Design a protein around this ligand. Sequence first.
Ligand SMILES: O=C(NS(=O)(=O)c1ccc(NCCSc2ccccc2)c([N+](=O)[O-])c1)c1ccc(-c2ccc3sc(CCc4ccccc4)nc3c2)cc1
Length: 164
Amino acid sequence: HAGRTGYDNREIVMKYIHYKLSQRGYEWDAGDDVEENRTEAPEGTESEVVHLTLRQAGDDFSRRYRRDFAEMSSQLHLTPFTARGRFATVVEELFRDGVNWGRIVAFFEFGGVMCVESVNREMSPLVDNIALWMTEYLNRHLHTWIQDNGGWDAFVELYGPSMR
Ligand SMILES: O=C(NS(=O)(=O)c1ccc(NCCSc2ccccc2)c([N+](=O)[O-])c1)c1ccc(-c2ccc3sc(CCc4ccccc4)nc3c2)cc1
């Protein structure tokens, strides 16, 4: 009794972040389990529509705010110990009062911003860790907000591309 797409907070973040790194050409060792996993074929026209919307959603945002999160990035600093604690401290501010499709878009960007921050130095593997925490906060907050507010289909339906 919950759609038939199987959207996974982990997968969505893994794809979005995976694309961000692709732009640079970094073969992010995401699917460490590279043993040919079919299960039910890669075909996912269902979650495919939102994959583009969500993927493009962040891009359009980053282009609008090119002097907000970029600066705060310097505050994050560079370290594996504080990195994990800094993430939660940042997201916490993303939604002080309440959550909304409008604010969540910034959520994805954050991960990508902090993710690349590690790659810039020499902590590519860390990119995987970030995604782990991202899904936690997204599933522990957003998920509940989206699930109660229609769901994923809402975002894509509300913010749908031209025609299709
Ligand atoms: O305007 C906003 N939302 S909206 O009006 O409801 C909207 C407007 C357009 C679209 N879509 C249009 C097509 S693409 C697009 C998507 C989103 C926004 C703009 C365009 C969408 N949406 O798709 O959900 C939502 C909006 C504006 C500003 C912020 C915002 C501002 C300062 C900060 S600081 C921070 C720390 C986390 C943090 C750290 C690092 C980086 C980011 C955030 N996060 C912030 C987030 C957050 C949301």
